Design a protein around this nucleic acid. Structure first.
Lengths: 123, 380, 147, 242, 255
RNA sequence: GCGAUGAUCUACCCAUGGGUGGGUACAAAUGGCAGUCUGACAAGU
């Protein structure tokens, strides 16, 4: 009867767009990857939006964060696998949270804006 | 066609019988808008016919919940039933002025002979009411309306947003402030009375500096004279004679060199000792209570660190929310030494995060983190 | 109550009076006083009807049931409203339940002293049972056997 | 600046707000509940004696609070006075509501509104601490649905980012706002619609407002703090609109 | 005489100041707690003692609406408290927390009672140790004087003008070292005599009372043979009373 | 049998012993700063 503390969570197609954009972002260094990295971007006000995983044990480590996101008006998503997110963000251990940062000098600009608007529509 | 209007307030409903109508074709006009603002004519426009108060804050809350949700409450049903003149619904149904087009259908299905109007016309009537208000009621309703507004607002807020009870933390905050300052001023008074009674008998002072036991010893000894071997065994029932301290104090009292003082000083200083003793009992009790609340509200962070230290962190941060919220370097702000400290800082940020945002904590998960940090320290 | 009085003691349109009472109750389900006079009014109804049939017959337990149904609904409703005065821990829950039960059963005791009297008190104690209160009203049962 | 300088407080032109001068200048408003910084902002202290007492002023970080960015970029009349009331649509925290409540002060009251839950929870905490606020934690699209709690709010502030911002203010303001009452909006280009560009967005929003009778008194950009933002101050006429 | 110990005099008065300070801070803190439960209170009633007594009386706004508050509080204010208890914004507190706050309140009351106990103790001790001064100028002020000057021989050792000026030594020394004009009251402000005097009269009465205080202080201090009945102080009070009322009667305007 | 739930990184002697120096929070004191106003007229008639 209550929505779970993870809602929203994306369908597989939107998973694909999110992870691909994340990968290109990590290859072009517009990306702060790591839970504390994410919280500190949110604080510093330089975040395009926030991805995070919904299978880490426990879930509450990163469930803290969307509170900041809702207050600051930045969108957030839960992808269903820290393992997949890690393999797609290009580091060695499973990753449970990442933040795509602002900068318009970004060769993936239109890609990220379209995907962000998709997320906003999800909400 | 607007004969009656229904208006409502935080503390009680009202129904008004409109004595005229502001004309309809031209009701964006300068003149009629001014007439709604100028009470000298809106009085002609409306007069009160009834006001039904509320019974309690709880029933007002449940009523406001219903009038939000769009269902008619019992008091509402009763007041309309008592007000509205009846009719044979097939010809010349009656009219009421409401602002909730959503509510309209519920009213209609209850009373099959009433028509709810919500035009810009009727919203203007209700706006005039909302503006002038307390002047209109002629005084029927006592009460700080505004006070009731704030109270009911908080109550309705909490009720829907689902505030929780155990998750209170300011109690932890104020509790640690008490324990700290209480140890401080208990020690202050302890050495105060210690110097004061050493004026009469400084041998006990140089013997025991321990404060609460000092207080109890003062409670026994009235003056430096009325001490026998029975009192020796009495102190043995108290702290210790096997340590020989009872013999020490009896010999020092027999040879006592502190000047003996006024009886009334003995009684009031005894009162003082009783005061400090009860205060120390109180501090220990409150410490145990803090342990209880920590292990209930946030045993995770506590088990990871400790009751009093977790309270230190929560107080210095501001609240459990903020401490969980902020990143895992400010928690350090609040060589191998630095390394293990930073590791513990990260892990306690973890514990705080879970231990706040959950609906209840998990001592076992806290223990898992504790054991992980312990195995890393062992790796050192 | 004053409007009820005028309507009754000057004309006594008993249907009109019962309507007045039920409306006033629906508006004020909190006032044990009003419950009190409604009950005693239905008592007045019953007694007047009984005496009138008596004199008619001289010239030439439905009632307890209705009284006690009024009693029952008054108990349930006042208990609910007294809880809802200050409307959460299990222990305060328990103590406030104790207090409201005390209040309601004190009101029942006032109903009894208000008081076919044997049948009325019989059903009152029946609804009761459906500590110190227990001993007081078993003493009451003894006093009924006396009566 | 640092933690040791002594500052000089000064009454700003807008009543309620205060310049704090030093080697470097700040905007500072009174604080209601002294001794608890809400969100990690420094708080100036003063002491006045009859025996002494401590009163406590609070800096208003204009980077983080939109109205304050506007004040520091200069508005002519900010309708929020030390006595009036306010409706504040869209306070995901008390981040600006704390300050607006402090300016409004003990005698006036200020209404807060939120749709979200968890921001609402934190709002409840702040509302517990401070008296001036009354919090409404409802979806902001139904003034009908919380008509319970508001009588002649004396000004409105809109922070929301929903592309129907002009409609939502039209609704709540019609229902609640006193006649000839300061509407203030904080317009946001991207939040309103991205494909069109900032100046057209501002134009079209001001158009919707000028049709729903809120004569827009002035406009401001608050450039050096945030991009594409704006604050549109308007006065609600309802009679003699033209 | 064992009761002739200004050492415990000064100890007692210093303890009085401190006890007042931490009584106030605990009052503030318990205000924070129970106001969090019930936040209209602190602004409605303000006496820490009375506030604590309501805390003792009730533990829930239901018991607030039920119990009687006749002795602590007048009725208009207490029905204000009852309506607030009905409609208060603050949350409701659990059993153990209520127990602990109630026990804090007992502690507050205990420090109160102990404080006035101590004050009357010092009253008796003071009339014992320096009766004439006590009768002349006032218990609390005389206690503070002997405290500030340390030992009684010292306090009588000093001359009159000092005992006048003894408090506001700071402003005195500032005036001296920069050639402004000297202060005049110091610690003997709160002496009841000055407490009825009015302005320039307060100054003149401070001066005369200070001199008589020197006389009485000394006689209580050194006299080998003491009656402990405050005769010199009493006649001195007669003297300064007379000087006062005659000065007061002299009005400065024209008639 | 590593890691984004976080890797690395934030004064002088006597060879993981002792002695020196500085920097913050708490207490101590009979240390210091640091010194106890003037000195015959006034008021009424």
């Amino acid at each position: 009867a209550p929505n779970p503390k993870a809602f929203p969570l994306a369908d597989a197609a939107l998973t694909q767009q999110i992870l691909d954009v994340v990968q290109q972002a990590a290859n072009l260094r517009q990306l702060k990857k790591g839970a504390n990295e994410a919280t500190k971007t949110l604080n510093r006000g330089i975040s395009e939006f926030i991805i995070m995983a919904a299978d880490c044990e426990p879930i509450e480590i990163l469930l803290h964060l969307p509170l900041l996101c809702e207050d600051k008006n930045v969108p957030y998503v839960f992808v269903p696998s820290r393992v997949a997110l890690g393999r797609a963000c290009g580091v060695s251990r499973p990753v449970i949270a990442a933040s795509i940062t602002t900068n318009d000098a970004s060769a993936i600009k239109t890609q990220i804006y379209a995907v962000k608007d998709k997320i906003e529509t999800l909400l | 066609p607007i004969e009656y209007l229904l208006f409502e307030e935080p503390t009680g409903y009202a129904v008004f019988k409109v004595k005229l109508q502001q004309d309809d074709i031209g009701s964006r006009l300068k003149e009629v808008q001014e007439q709604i603002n100028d009470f000298g004519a809106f009085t002609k426009l409306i007069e009160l016919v009834s006001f039904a108060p509320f019974k309690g804050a709880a029933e007002a809350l449940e009523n406001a919940n219903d009038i939000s949700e769009g269902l008619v409450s019992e008091s509402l049903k009763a007041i309309l039933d008592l007000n509205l003149p009846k009719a044979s619904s097939k010809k010349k149904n009656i009219t009421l002025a409401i602002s909730d087009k959503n509510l309209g259908p519920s009213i209609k299905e209850e009373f099959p002979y009433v028509d709810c109007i919500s035009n810009e016309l009727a919203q203007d009537l209700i706006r005039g009411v909302r503006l002038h208000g307390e002047k209109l009621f002629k005084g029927l309703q006592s009460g700080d309306l505004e006070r009731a507004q704030l109270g009911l607002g908080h109550a309705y807020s909490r009720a829907k947003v689902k505030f929780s009870v155990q998750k209170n933390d300011n109690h932890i905050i104020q509790a640690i402030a008490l324990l700290d300052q209480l140890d401080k001023d208990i020690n202050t008074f302890a050495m105060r009375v210690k110097e004061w009674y050493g004026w009469h008998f400084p041998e006990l002072a140089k013997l025991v500096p321990d404060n609460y036991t000092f207080a109890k010893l003062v409670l026994f000894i009235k003056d430096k004279a009325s001490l026998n071997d029975d009192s020796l065994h009495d102190l043995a029932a108290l702290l210790n004679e096997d340590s020989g301290i009872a013999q020490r104090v009896i010999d020092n009292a027999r040879i006592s060199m502190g000047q003996d003082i006024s009886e009334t000083d003995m009684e009031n200083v005894c009162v003082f000792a009783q005061r400090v003793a009860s205060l120390a009992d109180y501090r220990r009790q409150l410490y145990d209570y803090l342990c209880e609340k920590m292990h209930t509200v946030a045993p995770n962070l506590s088990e990871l660190i400790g009751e009093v230290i977790g309270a230190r962190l929560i107080s210095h941060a501001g609240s459990l929310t903020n401490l969980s919220k902020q990143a895992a370097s400010t928690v350090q702000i609040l060589k191998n030494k630095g390394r293990i400290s930073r590791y513990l800082a990260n892990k306690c940020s973890m514990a705080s995060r879970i231990d706040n945002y959950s609906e209840e904590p998990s001592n076992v998960f806290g223990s898992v983190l504790k054991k992980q940090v312990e195995q890393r320290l062992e790796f050192y | 109550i004053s409007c009820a009085k005028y309507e009754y003691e000057v004309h006594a349109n008993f249907k009109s009076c019962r309507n007045i009472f039920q409306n006033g109750l629906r508006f004020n389900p909190d006032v044990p006083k009003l419950w009190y006079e409604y009950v005693k009014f239905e008592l007045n109804f019953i007694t007047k009807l009984i005496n009138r049939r008596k004199v008619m017959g001289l010239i030439n337990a439905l009632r307890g049931d209705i009284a006690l149904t009024i009693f029952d609904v008054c108990m349930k409703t006042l208990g609910k409203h007294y809880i809802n005065k200050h409307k959460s821990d299990s222990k305060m829950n328990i103590e406030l339940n104790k207090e409201t039960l005390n209040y309601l059963f004190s009101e029942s005791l006032r109903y009894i002293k208000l008081f076919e009297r044997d049948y009325l008190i019989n059903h009152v104690l029946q609804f009761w049972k459906n500590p110190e209160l227990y001993l007081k009203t078993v003493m009451i049962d003894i006093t009924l056997n006396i009566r | 600046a640092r933690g040791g300088a002594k500052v000089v407080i000064e009454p700003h032109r807008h009543a309620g707000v205060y310049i704090a001068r030093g080697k470097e200048d700040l905007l500072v408003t009174k604080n209601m509940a002294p001794g608890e910084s809400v969100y990690g902002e420094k708080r100036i202290s003063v002491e006045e004696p009859v025996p002494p007492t401590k009163v406590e002023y609070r800096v208003w970080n204009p980077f983080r609070s939109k109205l304050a960015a506007g004040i520091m970029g200069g508005l002519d009349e900010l309708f929020i006075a030390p006595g009036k009331k306010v409706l504040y649509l869209g306070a995901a925290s008390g981040t600006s509501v704390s300050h607006v409540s402090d300016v409004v002060g003990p005698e006036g009251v200020v209404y807060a509104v939120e749709f979200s839950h968890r921001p609402g929870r934190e709002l409840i905490s702040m509302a517990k601490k401070r008296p001036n606020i009354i919090p409404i934690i409802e979806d902001a699209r139904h003034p009908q649905k919380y008509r319970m709690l508001i009588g002649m709010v004396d000004c409105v502030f809109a922070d929301v980012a929903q592309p129907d911002q002009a409609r939502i203010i039209a609704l709540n303001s019609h229902m609640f706002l006193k006649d000839q009452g300061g509407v203030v909006i904080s317009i946001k280009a991207n939040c309103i619609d991205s494909t069109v560009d900032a100046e057209t967005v501002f134009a079209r929003e001001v158009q919707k407002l000028r049709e729903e009778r809120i004569k827009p008194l002035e406009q401001l950009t608050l450039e050096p703090y945030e991009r594409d933002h704006c604050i549109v101050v308007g006065r609600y006429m309802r009679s003699g609109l033209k | 005489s064992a009761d002739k110990v200004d050492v415990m005099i000064i100890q007692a008065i210093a303890l009085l100041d401190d006890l007042d300070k931490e009584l106030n801070t605990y009052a503030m803190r318990c205000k924070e707690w129970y106001g969090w439960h019930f936040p209209e209170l602190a602004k409605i009633v303000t006496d820490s003692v009375a506030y604590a007594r309501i805390i003792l009386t009730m533990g829930i706004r239901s018991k607030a609406s039920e119990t009687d508050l006749s002795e602590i509080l007048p009725e208009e204010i207490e029905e204000r408290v009852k309506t607030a208890a009905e409609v208060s914004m603050g949350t409701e507190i659990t059993q153990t927390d209520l127990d602990n706050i109630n026990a804090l309140a007992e502690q507050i009351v205990e420090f109160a009672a102990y404080r006035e106990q101590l004050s009357n103790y010092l009253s008796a001790r003071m009339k014992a140790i320096a009766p004439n001064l006590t009768q002349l100028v006032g218990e609390l002020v005389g206690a503070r004087l002997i405290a500030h000057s340390g030992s009684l021989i010292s306090l009588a050792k000093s001359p009159a003008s000092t005992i006048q000026i003894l408090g506001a030594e700071k402003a005195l020394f500032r005036a001296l070292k920069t050639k402004h004009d000297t202060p005049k009251y110091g610690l003997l402000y709160h002496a009841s005599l000055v407490g009825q005097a009015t302005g320039k009269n307060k100054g003149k009465i401070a001066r005369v009372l200070a001199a008589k205080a020197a006389v009485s202080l000394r006689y209580d201090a050194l006299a080998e043979d003491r009656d402990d009945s405050g005769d010199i102080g009493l006649e001195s009070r007669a003297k300064v009373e007379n000087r006062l009322s005659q000065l007061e009667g002299r009005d400065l305007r024209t008639t």
